Amino acid sequence: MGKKELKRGLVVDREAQMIGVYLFEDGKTYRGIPRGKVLKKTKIYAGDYVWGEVVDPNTFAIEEVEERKNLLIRPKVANVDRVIIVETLKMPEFNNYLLDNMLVVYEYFKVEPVIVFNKIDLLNEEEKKELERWISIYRDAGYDVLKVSAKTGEGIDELVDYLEGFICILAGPSGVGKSSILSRLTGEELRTQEVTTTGVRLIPFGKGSFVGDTPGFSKVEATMFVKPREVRNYFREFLRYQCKYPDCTHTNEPGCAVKEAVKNGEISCERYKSYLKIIKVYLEEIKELCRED
Ligand SMILES: Nc1nc2c(ncn2[C@@H]2O[C@H](COP(=O)(O)OP(=O)(O)O)[C@@H](O)[C@H]2O)c(=O)[nH]1
Ligand SMILES: [Cl-]
Ligand SMILES: [Zn+2]
């Protein structure tokens, strides 16, 4: 009456001047038009949830922007529920140190990762066992991990179920299959540059999910975004110990609980070594903690 017909939408397209809004009520995308003065020093990004009014079959007047829970810087997208870090045991060769760096970075940006090992169709019997070994390490560390083959399609349905209702972004090094997976999910190709004015686009797919058509990080050094002294707050399996020993850096402290956990097999030598490498600390003691595997 004096009140507007407010409806909820999601910004799925954001280029220079334009805003594309996916209206949840009908699944249609409308041209979004901000309405108001605070509302233009109010930055609106892909991923932002908005409330507004449908003005006509092709236009939606944006009245409010919901507070966002996170904001990634590549691509520039708000409210990401899962960063899908695509990895492969081989082709390319898995690099656990770089995956650990990437996990630290996404934990810092406050986005939950899901590790997806692709190309399982290429593995021999011994490689399958090695892959299971890495999967156990990451699951024990506290992360969700899935296996898929974008080539055969195996595991893709399980991934779609896992991603229900989520806004997602694909990340991982070149060649792991990010574009192949996006193709399985949406029939679309991952956008790059030219074999600079791209924009961000979220593509609806599966059970009410959305995935970006541009990727997240490929290979990243955690300290480009996280202070070295803060890296320890982003190793998931360290957190229970840090709750009782808030100041322990897990470096030269002789009775460090994390080192004890590594010695007893509760924390993997692989993850602990990545931690020390990231903060650039060499410990002679590592030879005594890591010698069984
Ligand atoms: N054998 C096999 N090859 C795959 C699979 N997924 C992708 N590929 C191939 O891996 C290569 C790189 O895939 P692409 O999607 O471009 O990787 P991206 O650089 O991470 O986007 C291409 O030749 C894909 O056809 C898979 O599950 N099994
Ligand atoms: Cl500790
Ligand atoms: Zn410690």
From TrEMBL:
UniProt entry tagged with the keyword Protein biosynthesis: no
Task: Tell me the enzyme class.
Answer: hydrolase
Question: Per its UniProt record, what Pfam families does this chain match?
Answer: RsgA_GTPase
SUPFAM superfamilies listed in its UniProt record = Nucleic acid-binding proteins, P-loop containing nucleoside triphosphate hydrolases
Query: What keywords are assigned to this protein?
Result: Cytoplasm, GTP-binding, Hydrolase, Metal-binding, Nucleotide-binding, Ribosome biogenesis, RNA-binding, rRNA-binding, Zinc
Q: Does the keyword Lyase apply?
A: no
Q: Which cofactor does it need?
A: Zn(2+)
One GO CC term on file: cytoplasm
Q: Where in the cell is it found?
A: Cytoplasm
Molecular-function annotations in GO = GTP binding; GTPase activity; metal ion binding; rRNA binding
Q: Please give the biological process terms from Gene Ontology that the record holds.
A: ribosomal small subunit biogenesis
**Where is GTP annotated to bind?**
118-121, 172-180
Q: Which residues form the CP-type G domain?
A: 69-220
Oligomeric state and interaction partners are given as: Monomer. Associates with 30S ribosomal subunit, binds 16S rRNA.
The similarity comment for this entry is: Belongs to the TRAFAC class YlqF/YawG GTPase family. RsgA subfamily.
What is the recorded function of this protein according to its Swiss-Prot or TrEMBL entry? One of several proteins that assist in the late maturation steps of the functional core of the 30S ribosomal subunit. Helps release RbfA from mature subunits. May play a role in the assembly of ribosomal proteins into the subunit. Circularly permuted GTPase that catalyzes slow GTP hydrolysis, GTPase activity is stimulated by the 30S ribosomal subunit.
Q: Which NCBIfam families match?
A: ribosome small subunit-dependent GTPase A (TIGR00157)
Protein name, please?
Answer: Small ribosomal subunit biogenesis GTPase RsgA
